[PDB]
Amino acid sequence: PKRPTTLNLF
Amino acid sequence: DNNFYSVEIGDSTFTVLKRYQNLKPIGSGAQGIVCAAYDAILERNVAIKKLSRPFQNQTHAKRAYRELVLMKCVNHKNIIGLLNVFTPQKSLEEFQDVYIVMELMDANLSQVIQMELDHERMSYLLYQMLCGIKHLHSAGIIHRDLKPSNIVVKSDCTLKILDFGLARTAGTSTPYVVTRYYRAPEVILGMGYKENVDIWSVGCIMGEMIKGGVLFPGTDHIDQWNKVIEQLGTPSPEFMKKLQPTVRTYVENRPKYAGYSFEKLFPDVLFPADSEHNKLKASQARDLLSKMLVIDASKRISVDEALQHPYINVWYDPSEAEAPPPKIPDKQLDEREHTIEEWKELIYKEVMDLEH
């Protein structure tokens, strides 16, 4: 159940 | 050849080490701006927070100390990290303002509350927030002002808690210093506080993310309490009993509400697609919400409990959650009042200590 590593701050 | 230099930002002067250039205004702490800069040496963006003659007054002096002191001894990947402190003044006698350098994140939560996250992302962000918090608590310190403006993230999905001038240990000994919406009942109805007062803040934050808007608006400190009871419903007689009678009358006097359910407060509609595997359930979130957003301070879940909760613990890592506490130099116990002279004395030593 992997940690995310990216967060779209567009 | 002087080590500092000055720049006008509006009608604010920043006098900072030459290393730091291309300043840009960014915000406010409890006290201060707060200004982004290129640290030319380190070749990386920083935030420089100016505290203008912070000893100017009891309140200020006190907050400033804590801010400095906590900023110093705190170390956790979910607390915003210190990079440098200084004053451009050359003596204790001649001293007036302080500058703090912290890492610069990508944005504060504002922001995230805005886009529609997916469970894993949200859940994880909370997880972080909580670890960050549990760090602070693990040494007795309460944050008191957790709120999106005080929570920043990076685009790799990392998160840090921020701004400690507000932060102290429990109790009683103004009510209206913590951001109106994120005020726990204890704080609203002026009954002093304990750790999980933060947990309340976290509910409002988590809720806000899920709702896209502020959980309980409330136009004035008084209307605030309407927005709470409106939604959660009127607290038990049992609870009322604990209120200062003056408050207690007004409260008992409010119109009674049963209040909506969390399913109704927080329809499925709002949540994204449900988990990959079980635990990241739209309803699992609710169940957490239901244990955080609890009017009764002593019927309310803690960080530890919240880190255990099945919607958070999927990220659980002891090396992050049960980190070693921060050591606070014991002489400091965040309330002993002083003269503006003793304060200025204290801070300055404290800055002097911390200069390279």
Write the layout of secondary structure elements.
The complex is a heterodimer of chains A (10) and B (356).
Chain A: no helix or strand
Chain B: E1 4-9, E2 12-17, E3 20-25, E4 33-39, E5 44-51, H1 58-73, E6 82-86, E7 98-103, E8 107-108, H2 119-137, E9 151-153, E10 159-161, H3 185-188, H4 197-211, H5 221-232, H6 237-240, H7 245-253, H8 262-265, H9 282-292, H10 303-308, H11 318-321, H12 340-354
Antiparallel strand pairs in B: 1-2, 3-4, 4-5, 5-7, 6-7, 8-9, 9-10
What does this protein structure show overall?
The complex is a heterodimer of chains A (10) and B (356). Chain A is 0% helix and 0% strand. Chain A contains no helices and no strands. Chain B is α+β, with helices and mostly antiparallel strands and 356 residues long. Chain B folds into two domains: 1-106, Phosphorylase Kinase, domain 1 (2-Layer Sandwich); 107-323, Orthogonal Bundle (Transferase(Phosphotransferase), domain 1), CATH 1.10.510.10. Chain B has helices at residues 58-73, 119-137, 185-188, 197-211, 221-232, 237-240, 245-253, 262-265, 282-292, 303-308, 318-321, 340-354; strands at residues 4-9, 12-17, 20-25, 33-39, 44-51, 82-86, 98-103, 107-108, 151-153, 159-161. In chain B, β1 and β2 form a beta hairpin. Chain B starts with a strand and ends with a helix. Chain A: It is found in: Cytoplasm; Cytoplasm, Perinuclear region; Nucleus; Endoplasmic reticulum membrane. Chain A: This is C-Jun-amino-terminal kinase-interacting protein 1. Chain A: Belongs to the JIP scaffold family. Chain A: It comes from Homo sapiens.
